[PDB]
Design a protein around this nucleic acid. Structure first.
Ligand SMILES: [Zn+2]
Ligand SMILES: [Zn+2]
Length: 307
RNA sequence: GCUUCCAUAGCUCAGCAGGUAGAGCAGUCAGCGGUUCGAGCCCGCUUGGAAGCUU
């Protein structure tokens, strides 16, 4: 589980930072990549990385603003052109279906893969045996969301040495014991799988805030998460600019991660006003409140470790 | 440059939901790391081959 930042810029693209797009690498977990917002030139940034368009399984959109969506028709089109076979699921607010379908029909684009566009609302957006994604409404003026990718608890390691010692040879019965199933051995021996299993390991959690003002709903959504990817468009000084433009400051994002009891905070959606040298100042403004703060820059890779 | 299939006893390609290597002849399963109880098979990356590259 890795977080590759493709775009850390707010509103209009800059030479330093391209517009918003964060990739959630799940190659070991599910052989795929999950995108969090797809602003213009996301595909272009992807050409300088190991992430391939065909590797994308689902794209989650926070809000309909152009710096988060204008990369969608190009990325979807290229995936089909690279020989895309597997399904792609676009999650977004009301308007995303109109935007994708119109931009693909007028351009005369026929996808070589199935496209599912789910117009989401506050609650569980996607759920299966491995992951559970929940969206929550955020303060931005326009219909905006905050996502949480929650990895469901994995079953504990097999006490294989215990089985080997008990004259149980390694074979296809080992995966059945790993599930906890009461197995009937070749020589007629009944054993409970759960007895030879270590305590289950707690799953990882990444939170993508999108564009938002200081929100209590976002604090609750990011409860005890491994990595909180919060937007910090402005600095501590530009507090009034943040309110009037429906955004958050470095200090505001740091207070949220502190109260949510998050392990790490990554500041994204940074204004073009602040340069490479000024980025450290923004990071230190957040570090004073929440120490494990990182001000994200283009092509930043952050690993999400397990417990 | 990109994206997709090939590299296994000096040499023909056999292999299976991943269960501890099956043959013709005078086994560092290309390297390394990871996932896993366990990797030829799964995920990375580094090497050597082949084929596509119109929104
Ligand atoms: Zn934005
Ligand atoms: Zn916005």
């Amino acid at each position: 589980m890795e977080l590759l930042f493709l775009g850390t810029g707010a509103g209009i693209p800059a030479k330093a930072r391209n517009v918003t797009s964060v990739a959630l690498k799940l190659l070991e977990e599910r052989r795929s990549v999950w995108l969090f917002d797809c602003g213009e030139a996301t595909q272009h940034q992807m050409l300088h990385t190991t992430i391939k368009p065909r590797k994308i399984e689902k794209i989650f959109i926070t809000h309909m603003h152009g710096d988060h969506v204008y990369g969608l028709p190009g990325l979807l089109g290229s995936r089909s052109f690279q020989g895309g076979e597997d399904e792609l699921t676009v999650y977004g607010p009301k308007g995303i279906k109109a935007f994708i379908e119109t931009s693909l029909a007028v351009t005369k684009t026929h996808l070589t893969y199935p496209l599912a566009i789910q117009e989401i609302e506050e609650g569980i957006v996607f759920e299966d045996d491995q992951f559970i994604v929940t969206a929550v409404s955020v303060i931005h003026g326009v219909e905006a969301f905050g996502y949480r990718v929650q990895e469901k608890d994995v079953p504990g390691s097999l006490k294989a040495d215990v089985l080997k010692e008990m004259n149980i040879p390694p074979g296809p019965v080992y995966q059945k014991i790993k599930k906890g199933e009461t197995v009937t051995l070749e020589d007629g021996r009944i054993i409970n799988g759960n007895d030879f299993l270590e305590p289950p390991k707690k799953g990882r959690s990444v939170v993508f805030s999108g564009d938002t003002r200081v929100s209590d709903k976002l604090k609750e959504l990011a409860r005890d998460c491994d990595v909180m990817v919060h937007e910090a468009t402005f600095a501590k000084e530009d507090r009034k600019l943040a309110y009037d433009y429906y955004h958050s400051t470095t200090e505001q994002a740091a207070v949220t991660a502190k109260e949510a009891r998050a392990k790490q905070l990554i500041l994204t959606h940074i204004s073009a006003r602040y340069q490479g040298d000024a980025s450290l100042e923004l990071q230190k403004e957040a570090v004073d409140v929440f120490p494990n703060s990182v001000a994200a820059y283009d092509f930043l890779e952050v690993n999400v470790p397990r417990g």
